[PDB]
Amino acid sequence: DYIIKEKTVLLQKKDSEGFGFVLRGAKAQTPIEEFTPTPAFPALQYLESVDEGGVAWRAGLRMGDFLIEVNGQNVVKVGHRQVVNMIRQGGNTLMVKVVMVTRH
Amino acid sequence: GSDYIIKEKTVLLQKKDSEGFGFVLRGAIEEFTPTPAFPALQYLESVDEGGVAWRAGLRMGDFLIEVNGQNVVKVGHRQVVNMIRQGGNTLMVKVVMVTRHPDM
Ligand SMILES: [Br-]
Ligand SMILES: [Br-]
Ligand SMILES: [Br-]
Ligand SMILES: [Br-]
Ligand SMILES: [Br-]
């Protein structure tokens, strides 16, 4: 039985800083296939690391958070490259909907 | 934000010819993406108590993920219905029950 805790947070940063988090893939997907979300892995991208005291950190984001939406756009099946580009477009403002999965 | 309790269930239904599986399938634009809140396009609108589906553990609100091994998360209504009637009196379905608990 899974418990998925969801929330939408707003990240606001300065021009000379980053959002303070690193994104990686959930599993070792094969490039010849689309990602299939499951309760344990609801999104292709997840936060692999968050700098303590950084923008993402202060907003409540933590390692383990799965990325569901970027600036109102669903990115559950979207790759790293596109997500980075999407985040760039937003400049110093980034809205993300994330989920933390628990209880196995 | 909200908490989403997720319970996945895979059952095997077997019915007589003088009966149906005992459920009303409803289809949730035809290009959607699964999210923890809404994991699939088709879901059980109704399930007859004491029916084949009911006795197997299926309940109103369950989202259809697979029909006879085939992922139907993003498949249309007519197509899924055909897949179900294909197996005849036998239907193996994987579903996910989602209950939302809003934050306050
Ligand atoms: Br899918
Ligand atoms: Br791109
Ligand atoms: Br790309
Ligand atoms: Br969600
Ligand atoms: Br549909």
Swiss-Prot record, chain B:
Protein family (similarity comment): Belongs to the SHANK family.
Name used for this protein in its record: SH3 and multiple ankyrin repeat domains protein 1
Organism: Rattus norvegicus
Subunit structure: May homomultimerize via its SAM domain. Interacts with the C-terminus of SSTR2 via the PDZ domain. Interacts with SHARPIN, SPTAN1 and DLGAP1/GKAP. Part of a complex with DLG4/PSD-95 and DLGAP1/GKAP. Interacts with BAIAP2. Interacts with IGSF9. Interacts with HOMER1 and HOMER3.
General function of this protein: Seems to be an adapter protein in the postsynaptic density (PSD) of excitatory synapses that interconnects receptors of the postsynaptic membrane including NMDA-type and metabotropic glutamate receptors, and the actin-based cytoskeleton. Plays a role in the structural and functional organization of the dendritic spine and synaptic junction. Overexpression promotes maturation of dendritic spines and the enlargement of spine heads via its ability to recruit Homer to postsynaptic sites, and enhances presynaptic function.
Cellular compartment(s): Cytoplasm; Synapse; Postsynaptic density
Domain of life: Eukaryota
PDZ domain: residues covered: 10-99
Tissue spec: Expressed only in brain (neuropil of cortex, CA1 region hippocampus and molecular layer of cerebellum).
Modified residue annotations for Phosphoserine: S18
Disulfide pattern: none
